Design a protein around this ligand. Structure first.
Ligand code: BEF
Ligand code: BEF
Ligand SMILES: [Mg+2]
Ligand SMILES: [Mg+2]
Lengths: 128, 128
């Protein structure tokens, strides 16, 4: 019952309650998690490690997730990214898809069984 | 009511429930938190960033906190460290104090007001 053993997930999210929920879910599935409350902090961290997947919020205090994405994509980083956001802004969702994220999911998350499918697909893809 | 604004705290702890509690406490005090479920993961992360304080567990699955400490101290890292552990092993507590940790606190944590004092003292010391 641990399909994600051996996979490392970076979670970037400013609301501590949701940070805890994602940690609990992905840890229970066997992944080792790294959590960053802040986009600037996540940017610096990515300089020294290579997560298998990053789960990323959009609205965050100091630097939002779209700017985070641009910085790491501009430097050649092709880490798979799943965005989980409350945004309804279609331009901001399009910006993330242009930056090569696998999908953008809307908060609150309700089909946890679906989230599971998509995260596994992100970690063990069949095509590019 | 945010005495830790501007300070970054790394939390290394394998139990997700306690990981969440520390995140909630330190975030509410204004610190930005980075959480690692795993000691090997924390070691790699420290190669690319410089937290103001690390809060560290001892018993963790793959690599315990004492080995983590030795590795980063052996490489010249003098990040302040606070150990929060359930260990009753006096030799293991002594090992951490020999590796230069500021203190070793026993789980479960009950004087949250005291934890606050000691973390601030670690971040804003008066002497060496
Ligand atoms: F703050 Be996020 F965009 F949900
Ligand atoms: F697992 Be720890 F030493 F509390
Ligand atoms: Mg947010
Ligand atoms: Mg432990």
């Amino acid at each position: 019952t641990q399909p994600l053993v051996g996979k490392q997930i970076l979670i970037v999210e400013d609301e501590q309650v949701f940070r805890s929920l994602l940690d609990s879910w992905f840890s229970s599935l066997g992944a080792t998690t790294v959590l960053a409350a802040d986009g600037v902090d996540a940017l610096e961290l990515l300089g020294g490690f290579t997560p298998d997947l990053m789960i990323c919020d959009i609205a965050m205090p100091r630097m939002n997730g779209l700017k985070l994405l641009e910085h790491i994509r501009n430097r050649g980083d092709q880490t798979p990214v799943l965005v989980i956001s409350a945004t309804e802004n279609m331009a901001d969702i399009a910006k993330a898809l242009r930056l090569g994220v696998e999908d953008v999911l809307l908060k609150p998350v309700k089909d946890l069984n679906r989230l599971r499918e998509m995260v596994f697909a992100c970690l063990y893809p069949s095509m590019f």
